[PDB]
Ligand binder design. Sequence first.
Ligand SMILES: [Mg+2]
Ligand SMILES: [Mg+2]
Lengths: 281, 281
Amino acid sequence: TYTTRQIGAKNTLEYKVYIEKDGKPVSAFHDIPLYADKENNIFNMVVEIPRWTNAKLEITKEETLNPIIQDTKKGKLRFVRNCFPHHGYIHNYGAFPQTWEDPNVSHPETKAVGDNDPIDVLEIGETIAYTGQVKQVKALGIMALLDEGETDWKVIAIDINDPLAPKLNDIEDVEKYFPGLLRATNEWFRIYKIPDGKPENQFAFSGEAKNKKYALDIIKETHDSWKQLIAGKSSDSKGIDLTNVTLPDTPTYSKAASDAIPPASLKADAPIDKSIDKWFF
Amino acid sequence: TYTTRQIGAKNTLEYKVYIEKDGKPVSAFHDIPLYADKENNIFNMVVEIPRWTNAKLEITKEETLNPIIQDTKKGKLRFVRNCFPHHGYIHNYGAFPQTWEDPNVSHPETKAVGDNDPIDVLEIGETIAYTGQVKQVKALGIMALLDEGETDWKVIAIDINDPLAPKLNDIEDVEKYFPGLLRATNEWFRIYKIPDGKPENQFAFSGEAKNKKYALDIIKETHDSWKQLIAGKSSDSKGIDLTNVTLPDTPTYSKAASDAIPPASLKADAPIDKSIDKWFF
Ligand SMILES: [Mg+2]
Ligand SMILES: [Mg+2]
């Protein structure tokens, strides 16, 4: 829950980042506890995408110890384009470890199934995060995007160490201290696929971020799903590598998995094509 | 007009960038032709600040051969803060060489003396520029900014090599192809110093972007002020270093002034303080 090890040059198909715990690589999906402090609901967020970058990085469910790598489609590295007035991602974008949005399970208020991923976390503080960072955040609220039959929750969160953190407890405080960030968020998730020849995205609750308690209910839900997933009790974990090195009674415990990870690579960031500079109106 | 000579590391007090012609330093103020093609009105832009950066890099008017050095406040490096929804500068930001906002005379459009700097250029093309870059652009329009009460015109321009350049011929085309950019620009230059405890700036003509003909007219004015300044005929050159290596008919001409510049000593970018990340609202 500690440091990172980067495999490969950044902006490259070889690129992977592992989370290490005291030097040893663990699963970013499995071995990082959801709670840093359960009683107070301080969670561990695994950061994937720094604010104001483009490269579409994610925890790979299908790779052992679930490193963060860059999205590809048909062999090409995937980037989100700049969608005026936005520069790349407008949040530090990440996921809550030890959560899973069960596809074999649906929401009524959001007539839509899980998307088979960890719950997405938008961390809205001032400091730009780094890929593979485990930070402590509090949930402030939650939105619901609606990708094709599956509810895509995005928890809105703030780093516990942020100067403003004490002033922020519920979603209305985001309106108070970050005026327009909720609209920007809304705008961005709707249009950020359009430069990629995809359609406009579609929110539930008509774009409403529901509140902190509403976010807590969903997070604890997706945690319980992941408990049955990691326990081997899931109806269907097609593709998900459940290898972990900290949960000694799980079916898929395997300390040696840690030891099998190659050393930190000595490579400078690959250049990114200048096409990714482009601002799309 | 040609290449770059970097001294030290970016984001560092030691950092300078000289513009070289033929591997040798020339004055970035004086020695780069205003026009790359006067017949077709193609200007040479000197780029100071790439789009989406923060460091307040400036042509140093009072340093010999006028290298680009970062501005400082009470001795500390100056960065422009991020003003939501914007990230750093939203334009490739620079100046036309061989021009001067005359500080000694009240400008009739604005009723303010000039800001004592070359005329500023916002280059709107897709590719992000680099510091010390001389690029060829065409003028599209001009905005009448009173930046802290001084006449501070902003030329709206497009790199001649941009894919959209053939389509972009006047200020109506910017709205056409960059909807909302001009509104965002009016706003950006109003507010970008609020985080510094300075007031909101103002524009003449209610922020109306005047057209190309109006831009050419105002650039000519600033070019003529400069010719007087470089002839040593200004009522007050404000301590500006007028040393140059290409203009033999000026008092301050000196080919060998180029020889006295230290050789390139490029170091990797120094890290920037994390506070410069913050988004102000
Ligand atoms: Mg998701
Ligand atoms: Mg100026």
